[PDB]
Amino acid sequence: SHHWGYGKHNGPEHWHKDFPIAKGERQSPVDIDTHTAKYDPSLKPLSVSYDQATSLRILNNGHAFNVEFDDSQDKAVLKGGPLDGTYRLIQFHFHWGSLDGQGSEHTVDKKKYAAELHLVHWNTKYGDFGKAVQQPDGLAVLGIFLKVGSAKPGLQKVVDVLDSIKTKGKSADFTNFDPRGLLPESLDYWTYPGSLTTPPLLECVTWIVLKEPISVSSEQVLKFRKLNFNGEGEPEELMVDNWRPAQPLKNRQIKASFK
Ligand SMILES: [Cu+2]
Ligand SMILES: [Cu+2]
Ligand SMILES: [Zn+2]
């Protein structure tokens, strides 16, 4: 299923016609009301183990750009916190705005950040990603907010390759990239059960959203905004505002790892 996007004629308000789960019981993103989130002393320490991460390639897929990892072994994994067992990193990507005052998917007391990073992991008990996305605990996505201020040195290698993947369907080698350079100092987080935030909107995700944003420079985010939704030789449509707004919380509680 093709043709969904972020424009007025195929954006988030239309997705439910082809993806009825868009109106489901555990859709993402959500607004994080920080005063209603409750500290959960049962949460375990989160473990982000990216030392042996093996990046492979960066791809413009027409919706965002994905940095892809070799997930054929436990090389980069997420464990602990709300999670049972081991989740393997498969890709990361971002969502961002046309302006610094919008771009994130999750919001914090209705505050929109300039962008949001998603590090996507699948539960190794299900053998591969495709089977993991048929399970209610198949995926874990680590979300990190971006605000505009000082430059993030560990983002710059990503920014510098974007020129080579301007249009949909372009890819480039992207080996030897260390995703640890994209994390904030603190691993304090909020967690809740949700979904993919793009079609097919599957309800498989344990969301882990870090409280501390990373700072990126205006120049870094401006380069995200030079990408294109369209393919080569087609009319240019800047890749901006590729975020889904907050969805109803319904019968969910957001838990905090910190007091
Ligand atoms: Cu289709
Ligand atoms: Cu697509
Ligand atoms: Zn995402």
Side-chain angles (χ1 to χ4, degrees):
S1 204
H2 54 317
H3 295 198
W4 64 270
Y6 295 95
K8 188 115 209 178
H9 303 291
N10 65 359
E13 298 295 16
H14 292 276
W15 293 353
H16 71 103
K17 288 179 278 156
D18 288 278
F19 308 93
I21 203 172
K23 291 184 186 276
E25 301 300 312
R26 57 172 285 181
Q27 290 289 292
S28 294
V30 297
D31 180 56
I32 301 166
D33 190 274
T34 66
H35 294 290
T36 294
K38 191 181 188 205
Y39 171 61
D40 186 351
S42 74
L43 289 165
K44 259 73 177 157
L46 194 63
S47 170
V48 182
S49 309
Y50 290 169
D51 186 68
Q52 290 298 315
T54 297
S55 64
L56 291 173
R57 191 175 76 139
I58 190 171
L59 170 69
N60 177 337
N61 62 20
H63 311 296
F65 66 83
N66 289 179
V67 172
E68 301 163 352
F69 291 78
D70 177 5
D71 66 347
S72 69
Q73 179 98 51
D74 272 344
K75 297 192 161 209
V77 300
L78 185 65
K79 305 189 279 213
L83 303 172
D84 285 350
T86 297
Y87 292 67
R88 204 176 284 176
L89 179 65
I90 182 166
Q91 56 105 327
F92 70 76
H93 61 276
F94 306 78
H95 306 260
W96 64 90
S98 55
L99 311 158
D100 297 347
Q102 65 197 40
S104 65
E105 298 210 300
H106 295 89
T107 56
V108 179
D109 298 330
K110 299 296 178 81
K111 177 195 175 69
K112 291 170 169 81
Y113 287 88
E116 185 174 331
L117 167 59
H118 291 162
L119 295 128
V120 183
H121 313 73
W122 58 270
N123 190 332
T124 64
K125 81 192 278 156
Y126 303 121
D128 68 28
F129 180 88
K131 291 294 167 350
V133 298
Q134 301 172 242
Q135 321 302 149
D137 62 349
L139 298 181
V141 183
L142 180 62
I144 305 178
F145 297 116
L146 281 60
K147 65 183 286 193
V148 173
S150 58
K152 192 66 162 179
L155 182 58
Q156 193 58 31
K157 285 176 166 193
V158 173
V159 164
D160 275 330
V161 77
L162 297 184
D163 78 293
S164 77
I165 59 152
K166 186 182 168 188
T167 52
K168 178 180 171 350
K170 287 205 65 180
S171 67
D173 188 281
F174 204 69
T175 51
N176 306 110
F177 179 74
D178 185 352
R180 297 175 298 176
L182 296 173
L183 309 181
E185 282 175 11
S186 188
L187 294 179
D188 289 346
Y189 67 88
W190 299 284
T191 185
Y192 76 99
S195 73
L196 304 179
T197 69
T198 51
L201 301 169
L202 302 173
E203 291 180 336
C204 319
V205 181
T206 300
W207 278 96
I208 302 169
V209 177
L210 299 189
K211 171 167 177 199
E212 186 178 353
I214 62 165
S215 287
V216 305
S217 63
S218 185
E219 296 78 8
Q220 288 176 321
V221 69
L222 283 160
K223 287 181 172 202
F224 286 15
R225 299 185 190 127
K226 293 182 44 181
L227 289 164
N228 284 184
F229 286 125
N230 53 283
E232 188 179 358
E234 304 176 337
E236 186 168 32
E237 300 165 86
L238 296 173
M239 186 182 279
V240 295
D241 294 318
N242 60 347
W243 52 275
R244 188 188 196 192
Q247 300 300 306
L249 191 60
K250 298 181 162 177
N251 184 218
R252 295 179 289 179
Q253 288 184 329
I254 305 182
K255 296 299 189 183
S257 77
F258 60 93
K259 166 144 132 125

